[PDB]
Amino acid sequence: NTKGIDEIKNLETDFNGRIGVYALDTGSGKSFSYRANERFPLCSSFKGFLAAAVLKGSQDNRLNLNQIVNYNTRSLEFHSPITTKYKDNGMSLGDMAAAALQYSDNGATNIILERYIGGPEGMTKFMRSIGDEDFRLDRWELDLNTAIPGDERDTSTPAAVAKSLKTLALGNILSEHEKETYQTWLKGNTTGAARIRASVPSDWVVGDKTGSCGAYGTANDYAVVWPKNRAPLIISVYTTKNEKEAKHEDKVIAEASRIAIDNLK
Numbered sequence: 001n002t003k004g005i006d007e008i009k010n011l012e013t014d015f016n017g018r019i020g021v022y023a024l025d026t027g028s029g030k031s032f033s034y035r036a037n038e039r040f041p042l043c044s045s046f047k048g049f050l051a052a053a054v055l056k057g058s059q060d061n062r063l064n065l066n067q068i069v070n071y072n073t074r075s076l077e078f079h080s081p082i083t084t085k086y087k088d089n090g091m092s093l094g095d096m097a098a099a100a101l102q103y104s105d106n107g108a109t110n111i112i113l114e115r116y117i118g119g120p121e122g123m124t125k126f127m128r129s130i131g132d133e134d135f136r137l138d139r140w141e142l143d144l145n146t147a148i149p150g151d152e153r154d155t156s157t158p159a160a161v162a163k164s165l166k167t168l169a170l171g172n173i174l175s176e177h178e179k180e181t182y183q184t185w186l187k188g189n190t191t192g193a194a195r196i197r198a199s200v201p202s203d204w205v206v207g208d209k210t211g212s213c214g215a216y217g218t219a220n221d222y223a224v225v226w227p228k229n230r231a232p233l234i235i236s237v238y239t240t241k242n243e244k245e246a247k248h249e250d251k252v253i254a255e256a257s258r259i260a261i262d263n264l265k
């Protein structure tokens with residue numbers, strides 16, 4: 001059978017859940033897919049796209065990344081490591097957008113969704129405008145993390161996630177300068193050491209955004225991977241389980257990425 005398909009099937013069987021993967025080599029055009037068209041919860045992964053929406057607004061001159069966002073009288077959401085630190089005097093919209101991505105900051109995420117993106121509807125609308133028919137954000141943080149089997153709320157497909165990431169990071173939606181900023185933000189992510197980053201050799205450069213729902217063993221990661229002396233790779237790995245109390249498995253996500261990279265065709 002086709003390279004790596006059985007291996008990913010076996011990984012999935014051992015994991016006892018559902019694994020969805022889509023990897024693309026932008027240099028050769030080769031790819032690897034497994035349940036790439038199935039829905040999986042986005043969890044915090046959508047924040048990487050929220051950052052891109054902010055960048056598009058900047059480019060459109062509908063907003064300015066230098067604008068100081070004040071929230072000294074707003075209580076911050078669970079897991080707001082950066083916004084909590086700067087709550088007294090606020091932070092630029094640019095720094096807040098970066099924090100939402102790099103630290104999965106929930107305060108930054110909800111503040112930006114409210115004041116600049118138009119909430120879940122606006123986020124969904126932005127993705128629709130770039131060609132993504134699958135992505136759907138329906139709830140705010142941290143309600144969007146339920147990850148209930150069969151529930152289509154706050155889900156997307158590994159393929160759609162990959163298509164959108166390539167469109168944003170390597171397409172022409174964002175201008176050259178905004179893409180540089182987006183790629184820089186992705187490269188500075190602090191939460192993906194055990195996922196896609198763990199599947200590639202040390203000299204490859206990774207830019208990613210992880211997502212961990214904390215329910216139904218749901219976790220994911222997507223990334224732009226720059227191999228030494230090669231064109232970028234777009235990797236999208238999403239996983240889920242049927243037990244509500246099951247824990248996520250970083251090793252499984254990493255192995256699915258390794259398999260995909262090694263089996264492009």
Ligand SMILES: *C(=O)[C@@H]([C@@H]1N[C@@H](C(=O)O)C(C)(C)S1)C(C)(C)O
Nearest residue numbers: 043044079104191210211212213
């Ligand atoms: C999103 O899934 C989650 C935050 N992001 C994950 C991750 O990126 O792996 C953390 C474990 C860092 S916390 C919540 C807190 C649900 O928004």
